[PDB]
Amino acid sequence: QAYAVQLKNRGNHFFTAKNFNEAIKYYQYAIELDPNEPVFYSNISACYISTGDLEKVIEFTTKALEIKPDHSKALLRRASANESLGNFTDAMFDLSVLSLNIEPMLERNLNKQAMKVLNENLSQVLPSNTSLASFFGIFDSHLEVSSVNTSSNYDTAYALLSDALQRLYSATDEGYLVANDLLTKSTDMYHSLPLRENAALALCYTGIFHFLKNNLLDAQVLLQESINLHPTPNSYIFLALTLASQEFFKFFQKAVDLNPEYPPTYYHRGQMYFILQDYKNAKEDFQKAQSLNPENVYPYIQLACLLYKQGKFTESEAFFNETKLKFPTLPEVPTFFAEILTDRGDFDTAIKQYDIAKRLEEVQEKIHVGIGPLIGKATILARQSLDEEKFNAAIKLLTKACELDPRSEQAKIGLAQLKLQMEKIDEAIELFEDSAILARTMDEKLQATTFAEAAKIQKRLRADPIISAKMELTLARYRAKG
């Protein structure tokens, strides 16, 4: 034992002078006298990483870790050689064990893994019914259905298009699936074929559905085609949304030119002004939308929301109250108000407003706010929760929301984070992975894939009794120290 230490120190001398071959020779000498010492194997791996033999690093760190599984230098070296070799999951596992005895190394490996899995996964599906009802909420449903021209002598596809629009504007689960289906059919039929006006209408709505399905290129193609056939406010609005400031506002002026009295033109432009912090022009556009369609709840909602974002909560609350008196049965009112209240930190009143909205949504024949209230209440309850009643209540609401609107990535992500918190990790992974498929942008997809890949490491850590015990002890100690 003692002579083996002397030999290791001789090896250390050769290591310091960058004579790695002589160092390994002395460390192996030490192993021949005392093979139960992890440091000897660990020291050999330092020689192999300095020369660049990553495969041997893994061999010798592993031999160290087979003796002493918490050996910090051998864990760090093994993770380094694993990362270099592209074994990110293996690196993440060693770094997690090390973290229990680094954080940017773990994150780097997670991001390398998530990026890898997303690319493999990448080499037709509608958004949630809730999102669809929200998107189409501003439109005058009678006007849109009635916009189909029946006076043609050659159009054999008008009646199918009429049906597609009726089903779309029914604002139902089945209606959106049927509309998507019949709209694609109509577009094919119009390509084969008042007719030009109907063709542009079919292409316009098929175009926006492509935008909503995340087919941005297919959206622009059918929309520009629609404009070429018979330009309408809708087609310019829809193309401007597909391409989202200078160009956006150019398209909206073209929309304005075609019909200065079309309410959704000013609503959608007001939304852009709102996002761009131009509160003056946003207000003026929402007021234009309201005057042109005083029966639509959404312009009122946005004017109230504007008052809040400008720091006038009292005036906002009063505007919401005034809106309540005009629209007493519409869940949109308490839903957006509950969003304001949550943001203001008033969780008690937000829950009450979400309860009202849930009740109003249940009695409506059409979808208005969908699962919005369920997500909203559950997110508050989960945040308010050691409080097992509120946590399990949040689980029940999000499970219900996932069941009612299966294509909602928001609901799945919400439920998964909670499943993960209660160590239902397999369930969390599945939910995260389904959320990645449903996710829209590249960053949202990578985000959901990142959650899944991180969750799989947690699963792997939890499967080991010793690591699992260590993890639980860490949490227990943290809570006790608090």
Partner: peptide, 4 residues
Amino acid sequence: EEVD
């Protein structure tokens, strides 16, 4: 980088 470092040896024990």
